[PDB]
């Protein structure tokens with residue numbers, strides 16, 4: 001059972017930077033003799049083997065055919081905005097609604113992430129984002145890919161949200 005994590009949000013909010021920081025501290029080699037290299041790289045987060053995908057919808061991915069496929073396949077979603085980019089925060093609701101529509105479910109594991117919290121130019125207050133997360137019923141954390149503040153915790157929290165969802169669906 002790999003946990004399938006998807007990182008979603010506006011262009012330039014730091015999705016790649018966050019994911020690279022996570023992989024750097026959580027990748028391992030795994031022995032697998034049924035593979036014609038005998039070892040593969042895996043990411044292990046809070047004891048779980050995880051797959052990682054980044055969903056962009058702007059830039060080159062404005063020409064993509066894959067947006068809904070990423071939402072169907074992902075099991076939990078890091079919904080990233082940047083604390084110095086009001087429009088990226090306003091975009092979050094559209095991403096969340098789209099995920100709910102594609103997955104046809106109201107309880108989708110998700111964590112709201114306010115990235116670039118090292119920056120002094122802030123236009124999205126912590127309380128604004130906390131209120132949004134509370135309405136959705138999901139955790140909120142502020143992160144910095146530059147300082148590593150919050151990065152591990154954001155992904156660990158998402159893994160726990162997926163775990164609790166899998167435990168519920170099993171029951």
Ligand SMILES: Nc1nc2c(ncn2[C@@H]2O[C@H](COP(=O)(O)OP(=O)(O)O)[C@@H](O)[C@H]2O)c(=O)[nH]1
Pocket residue numbers: 010011012013014015016017018115116117118119143144145146147
């Ligand atoms: N100061 C600061 N810059 C960041 C942070 N995360 C990403 N960046 C910068 O923001 C820009 C976009 O980051 P990127 O990972 O390419 O965002 P993506 O388009 O969402 O994948 C790059 O210049 C990054 O170096 C952060 O936490 N703090």
